[PDB]
Amino acid sequence: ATIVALKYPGGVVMAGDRRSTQGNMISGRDVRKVYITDDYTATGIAGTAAVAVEFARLYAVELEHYEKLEGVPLTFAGKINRLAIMVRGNLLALPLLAGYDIHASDPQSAGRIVSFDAAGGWNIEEEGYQAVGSGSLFAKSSMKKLYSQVTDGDSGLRVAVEALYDAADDDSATGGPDLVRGIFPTAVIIDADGAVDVPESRIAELARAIIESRS
Amino acid sequence: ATIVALKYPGGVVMAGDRRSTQGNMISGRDVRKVYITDDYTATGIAGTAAVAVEFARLYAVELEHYEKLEGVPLTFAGKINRLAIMVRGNLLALPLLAGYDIHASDPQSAGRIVSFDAAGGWNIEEEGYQAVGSGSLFAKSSMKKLYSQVTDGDSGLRVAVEALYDAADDDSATGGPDLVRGIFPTAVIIDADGAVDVPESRIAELARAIIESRS
Amino acid sequence: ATIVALKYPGGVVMAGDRRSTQGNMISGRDVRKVYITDDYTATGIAGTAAVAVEFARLYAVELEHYEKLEGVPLTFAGKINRLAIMVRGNLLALPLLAGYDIHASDPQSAGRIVSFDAAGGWNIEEEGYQAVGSGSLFAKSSMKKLYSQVTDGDSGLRVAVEALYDAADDDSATGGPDLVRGIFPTAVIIDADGAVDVPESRIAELARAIIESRS
Amino acid sequence: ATIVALKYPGGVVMAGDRRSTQGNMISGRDVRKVYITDDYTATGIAGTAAVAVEFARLYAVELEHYEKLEGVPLTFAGKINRLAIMVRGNLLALPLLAGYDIHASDPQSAGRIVSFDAAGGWNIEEEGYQAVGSGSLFAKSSMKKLYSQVTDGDSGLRVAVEALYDAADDDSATGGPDLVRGIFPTAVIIDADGAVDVPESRIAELARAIIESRS
Amino acid sequence: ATIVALKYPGGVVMAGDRRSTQGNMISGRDVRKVYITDDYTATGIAGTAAVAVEFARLYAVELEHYEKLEGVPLTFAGKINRLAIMVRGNLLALPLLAGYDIHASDPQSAGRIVSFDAAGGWNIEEEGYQAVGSGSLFAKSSMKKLYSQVTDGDSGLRVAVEALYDAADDDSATGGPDLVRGIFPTAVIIDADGAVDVPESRIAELARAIIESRS
Amino acid sequence: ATIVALKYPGGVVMAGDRRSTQGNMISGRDVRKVYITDDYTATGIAGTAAVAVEFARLYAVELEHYEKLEGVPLTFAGKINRLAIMVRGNLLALPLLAGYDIHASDPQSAGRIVSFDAAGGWNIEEEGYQAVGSGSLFAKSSMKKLYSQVTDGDSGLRVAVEALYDAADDDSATGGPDLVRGIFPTAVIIDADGAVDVPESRIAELARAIIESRS
Amino acid sequence: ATIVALKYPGGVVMAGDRRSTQGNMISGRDVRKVYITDDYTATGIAGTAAVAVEFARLYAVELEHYEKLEGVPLTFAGKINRLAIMVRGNLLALPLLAGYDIHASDPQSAGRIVSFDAAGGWNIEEEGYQAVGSGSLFAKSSMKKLYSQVTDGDSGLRVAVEALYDAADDDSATGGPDLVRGIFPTAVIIDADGAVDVPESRIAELARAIIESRS
Amino acid sequence: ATIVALKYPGGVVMAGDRRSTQGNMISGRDVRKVYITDDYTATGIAGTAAVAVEFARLYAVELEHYEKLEGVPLTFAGKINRLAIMVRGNLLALPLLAGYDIHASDPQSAGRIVSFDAAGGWNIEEEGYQAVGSGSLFAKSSMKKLYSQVTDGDSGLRVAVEALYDAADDDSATGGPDLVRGIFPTAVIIDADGAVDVPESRIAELARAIIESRS
Amino acid sequence: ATIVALKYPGGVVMAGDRRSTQGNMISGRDVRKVYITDDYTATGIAGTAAVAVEFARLYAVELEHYEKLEGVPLTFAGKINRLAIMVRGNLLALPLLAGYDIHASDPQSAGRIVSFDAAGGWNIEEEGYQAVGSGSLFAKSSMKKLYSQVTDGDSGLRVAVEALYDAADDDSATGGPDLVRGIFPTAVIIDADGAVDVPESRIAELARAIIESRS
């Protein structure tokens, strides 16, 4: 499994693969690993569907509990602090966080990426892209060369899909586009208007274009 | 990796995949695992290309040494005896042997399949098909249902390619047809006229037909 | 032991074998491993009769306690949540859940199958069939080829019995139809009218027909 | 696997099952475990076909080497001595030996059964029957009650087949009569005229009669 | 030690041996291992006299406590549930339970046998006989052949004594009839009129008849 | 197993039991553990029949080789020296040696008993009796009280049989007189005229008399 | 150390040795190991004086506490139950209990002997004698032959002293009569009139007579 | 350390870094890891200078010994066979081989790359580029995107230097261009005219251009 | 076991006990542990009779071999050198050596005692007495007080017997005078006329006198 997040002017994009395996045997085919936990925040865990969905549900419940109790949503700094408490208490796969900062001075530079290390410490990415999972190295090396082509949301989505394809090309634990069954990776786009899921047809067309170009 | 061999009236077919990995990382893309070691005998080892090619070279050298020394090729019973000595001396992956018995009373029932267990003991298959490797179980379960359709060499080749596809569908260590790079599994057909390699275009067309049917 | 569940238009079917062993010695001959725990829900545990019956009794008591306390039966989403709490608390063999969703928009697509992994996480099957136990791989590989013939309840029952037969054919820990003692596998069918046990004579006739066809 | 040998007036009978497994998975279906190594001697090893056939071949070669060198066949006492040397050198499964003593004073009491323990020591049976393998206990307990019915070769063969059936009934590693595939146990009868293999039709009829009686 | 229980029309019988040893040395000669814990229920533990008598005393105290508190004896289903709680709490040798169901629809089919596995799970026997202990296998194999002769209480008692004799014949940890000291196995018969101990003279005569027949 | 040897005026007697077991299961019923290896010497090994018979054969071959080479039998001191070399080379059960010294000054005090310890050192008994095996302690304690009644060969034989009975009474690994099958212990008597085997009828009558007296 | 207790008509006797050692070095010379804990009950522990005296003191305090609280002495069945609770709580050497049952129907058969195994379970002796300690086997084997001579208290005392002498003769950890220092074993006799200590002169005379007879 | 080799039309290029470390401490600054061992063959070992230089010297001595003995240089197939013998004998770091095949039918497709796995098996690269060492993954991922720009020797050299820079950017064990000390990576170019070392000024200019472009 | 040697004017005396045990059980009663290996030399090993007698035989054979080869007996210095070679080669119990030096300048000071440590090094005693074995400490402490009374051979013998008695009084592994069986310790006296064994009656009288004095 591999989850990739990269920043573009005016927002941030997130995507993940759809494969879960027990060693050398394929366990699932349409595993969803990216979820929307808030109006301006999405999370992703590289692992089984159950762990990721439980983590997303717990984070959403915590955020909504604070929101209902105090009547105001938490600041982005406070959102990261609560997430790290949950990660430390659990310990395991580590989560990836991407969101939008609506209180930032510059709207064009408001997208954020947060990563947690093995020890549970959180770091804020400054290179504009981050990948986690087994194929994280290949995806990051691909984004290193492909990040110069990102200028808007569509370019960022294309680059993320290409990074996922490159990661799946070199890792057997990551699944590539399934053009026989029709199962493509899921993506989430967060901007000033909020976090929205990308429709499967645009994902499908981008994957088909990348596959045709690679031939 | 998975190597499948099945018997058809008047001969026998053998095929193998083209993937080698170090755990979760793909190492090779066009690995050849089936070789022709005699005029009426082919062998296959599920593993790296180097081990398989060295084993095939050693077996061919031994057979040719006996042939040149005594002026007559060994009997099929004597060929199996020498192979088991080589397997026992080495110990590891285990080989698969398929050949044609030209001294058999019935030419239509002359194809043979030989398998070696972990302890090194050899067994002669009587069910008409055999598969070895990590995806051997899935391939054998597929041939269990698909063996009723085998009536000639082409039907056997189609069934073998379908078995390889089914094995690759459930195992991440076995590679399926590569329709982007153009790398398809290798096959060997042995009949009364001798062992011959199958051209890559017929392999390609059968793989394409199977993929289209599966969609 | 092997428990197989597959979906058909308008419902879902579940079946299991009748063998329990201590290693290489047969312990029981008429072990029941599928139980009805609710009007629209059945469960199955691959193991001894005592563990399965205790699990079914506990689940039924929990469901009935909530039903009597709140006056309304739990939703299907809430039923899975309570079951996962019980599985996590115990840890062991893992359960298989099949039920009918009466609140679904499409009645023809209301059957559900739920599986729990080793870590205790629950997953909802989307491929239409699922098998658990020691012979799960063979049963799943058989259903992979036989699922195209399922169009109603009787077809699904035939396919499930054939899958159980194929699983018992390759595994020594799973028992096949006993035509001398008269012990055949047990099956449960859940539809819009509720969960009902299948009579032993229809099971017997289907097993006899399959055995005759295999000869 | 289980090999049973019992004495009848004027000879001795030997039989074995046709199942080989790797733990809980069935490996073979028509494994032969009883072989004729001399004109008045047969042997049987509970295990894989390769080990048993190699042991029989080695024993036959040794016996024939002595026979050709000295011009006279070895005495029965000398045959056991050479066999124990081979067993000790190897060490593992242990062999079972049955033969006819043509130099005995009483022709009716000439059948012999020899067993080797774990330490490699040989013992001559005096209770008239002996069983080795995983299901040896059940077979011996069955022969304990069924030995009173043995009065000739046919009665002994029936009792041996019934003992094999009883052993397979309680052990999952021993295979019973296959009335679908048509694979029945192999038997060898040794008398004053020499050791002969029993035809498969008489085996089949006895198995069918026993199965019908058990119903 | 070995405890055997078998069902006959209108009741059930239970018997056990009278030997306790510390490895290869005999410790006791007249150990009693079967006790009456209720008007329609008896239990037996294969082990030392102290453990069995303490278990029987505890079970009787629990049953009588419930009987005095609620004024009505427990149902047979409730009696098994309380016994399993005691077995689980202790963990060891495992108990054997035999009793009469006075609320059953058919009086002739009211005898019950309950067995507990190593994990502590309880199972209800359906084959009509059950044996526990070190010589359980031999006793069960003997009852397999001798169960066709059971038609009343006396026939069942004879078959149970013969099973105990056969178990003691092959196991050194089980004691046979002592015709020098005069110590014979103890038996308990439960019918519609209640559980009663069998007098030692009928046990003695049956043992003497069996010994004479075996000579 | 237990082997007992005691001295009487003018000779020495030796006897052993007829039981061999693998732990708690009886392996043999008529095991012979005492053999005659010379005209004035017998040996006995507590263990399986194969080890004892091989040891006796080797000792006899060594003695006969020296006798044929030098033309004169070895002295009793030289016989013990060669036996200790064989015991040390092997290392295991330890042997017991009893013989007659024809060169002794006093014919009435010529019987000898030799015992080997765990370290392999040999000792000459001076208390007049010695027992080896698992039940050696009970047999020796019985002979301690019963040695005052030995005045000739028949008295010594009776005392030896009684010692064997007492040893079997307290040890489960030693077999007592079998009055159903008719298997009684074997005995050897060595005097000035040589070593002779005792007929089974005198053994049988002495065992029957002892059993009757014990009742 | 060895403690021996045997029953005679109308009572019971108990005796023990006077040696305590730390391995191969003698620690004490006049250790007392038998104590009177009640009017009709005595106990003995094979070990150091401190442990035995503390155990006797605790048992006496418990018995007297119940006697003073309820005004009536405990029944013999209740006395054993309290003792087993003390033994189980401690866990070690195991105690030996001998007493008189004044409520028994037959006064001549009122003596009782109770033994505790390693697991802490109590057993009531029925063979009339029991010995515990390191030399228990020799003492029991001696009493086996010497029990036929017991007809009154004096005969039982003589037999007990002889058993102690025989146990000390074969065990280095048990001390025999000291005719230089004047230290002889201690004995306790319990009858209908109560438990009384035997004077040292009668012990001394019996030991001297036994020693003279043995010479 | 990282060694990269890639093929261009009419030849092949090889390059390596100049860093050797003991864990986290830098050991060397100008380590040479690529050597010319023949007129048409160069080798490279990722490790210390001593091991690489000894390996190159041994390979050159072996090749020259065969050349002088037989008067003709070895074929490319024979050169690989001798190298694998040396690798197997040593076992450790694994070598990388690049050379020119002058007997190939197509001069433009004559460059060869050979890699040895951990087990010592040799493989011939078909993807046109190969990298070994600690930073091999990053270098290979960089060449994956940069291989489309290779059309001649200079383009291949630029791509190799860029791959080395990318590998050093992500790995702390690989050294990048030293613009203060003046130490740049070493490169070897093999073509139809033979293997030649690249001058340090062209390496320096390419490194400077890449660094300027990256800024 | 304990062996004591002490010097008196004009010679030296040596004595040892007659007990051999396996832990807490007595093995022998008349074990001899002191032997005469030369005309002026005796040795003693604390252990089993077999080891001591074999050591004495080997030493005597070596001494006699040198004596016959060279025609002159070895010097006392050369005798110790050969003994140490034998001790070192064996490695275990350690020997004690006592002898007479006939070439000494002072005949009254010619007795010698040699001791070997655990490492095998030999030392010559200068305190006039030495004891080895388990009870060596007690014997040495007794001789420390009793050495002032030694003035001739008889006084030394009395002191040695008293030391043995004191050693046996405190150690359970050493046997004291047996006044019932008549087994007393063995002693050897070496003087100018040679080494001679002490008759058993003088040993007996000295032991009786010591025992009477101790009372």
Author numbering:
A (entry chain W), B (entry chain V), C (entry chain X), D (entry chain U), E (entry chain Y), F (entry chain T), ...: 1 to 91, 99 to 222
From the paper:
The Mycobacterium tuberculosis (Mtb) proteasome system selectively degrades damaged or misfolded proteins and is crucial for the pathogen’s survival within the host. Mtb 20S core particle features homoheptameric rings in a conserved α7-β7-β7-α7 configuration. These rings assemble to form three interconnected compartments: two antechambers formed by α7-β7 and a central degradation chamber. Stacked β-rings enclose the degradation chamber where active sites containing the catalytic triad of βT1, βD17, and βK33 proteolyze substrates.
Here we determine near-atomic resolution cryo-EM structures of Mtb 20S CP, revealing an auto-inhibited state, 20Sauto-inhibited, that interconverts with the canonical resting state, 20Sresting. These structures mainly differ in the conformation of a pair of β-subunit helices at α-β interface, which we have named switch helices I and II, following the convention established by Losick and coworkers. The initial frame closely resembles our modelled inactive consensus structure of 20SβT1A (RMSD 0.44 Å), featuring additional conformational changes in switch helix II. The S1 pocket and the conformation of the catalytic residues are unchanged. This represents an observation of an auto-inhibited conformation of the switch helices in Mtb 20S CP, which we will refer to as 20Sauto-inhibited. Molecules that selectively bind to and stabilize the 20Sauto-inhibited of the proteasome established in this study, rather than the well-known canonical resting state (20Sresting) could be critical to future inhibitor development efforts that focus on allosteric rather than orthosteric sites of Mtb 20S CP.
